[PDB]
Amino acid sequence: YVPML
Amino acid sequence: AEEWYFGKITRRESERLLLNPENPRGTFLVRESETTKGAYCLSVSDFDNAKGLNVKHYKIRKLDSGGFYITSRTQFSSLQQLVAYYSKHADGLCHRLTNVCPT
């Protein structure tokens, strides 16, 4: 997973 | 819009499906998250002129207040509204959503 806030 | 909802498939299998060379960049599917129970995942094929074909995975979280979101500031009232939205604007994603992954 792309760490998105 | 259901065709893009693949339910319970593993990360491994989504990557096998999406990394088909014949899929245009931005081919996607939505599946349940393997590792975060209750979350979904938006899996998208992408191209880097270095990595080449690769797949990005975006965890879709559900607010307790009900909504869905990938980034905190843009929430959706359903997965189908979220798919319609990112099919029009990439808005933080590697690429806009284009084809639904075959099968």
CA gap B41, B34 in Å, rounded: 9
Within 13 Å, how many C-alpha atoms sit on residue A3's CB side?
A: 0
Our measurement of the distance from residue B79's CA atom to the centroid of its chain's CA atoms, rounded to an integer in Å, reads 10
CA distances, B8 to each of B21, B44, B61, B71 (Å): 23, 16, 16, 23
User: Which residue in A4, A3, A1 sits closest to B11, CA to CA?
Assistant: A1
Resolution in A: 1.5
What is the C-alpha to C-alpha distance for residues B51 and B63, in angstroms, rounded to an integer? 34
Which residues on A lie below 8 Å from B94 (Cβ)? 2
Structure determined via: X-ray
Residues 1 through 5 of chain A touching chain B, CB cutoff 8 Å:
1-2, 4-5
- Domain B1-103 homologous superfamily, CATH: SH2 domain (3.30.505.10)
DSSP bridge partners of B42: B30, B58
Single-letter amino acid code for the residue at B15: E
Domain boundaries, chain B: 1-103
C-alpha distances out from residue B51 to A5, B28, B95, B99, Å: 24, 18, 15, 21
Question: Between the CA atoms of B7, B84, B57 and B95, what dihedral angle is there, to the nearest 10 degrees?
Answer: 150
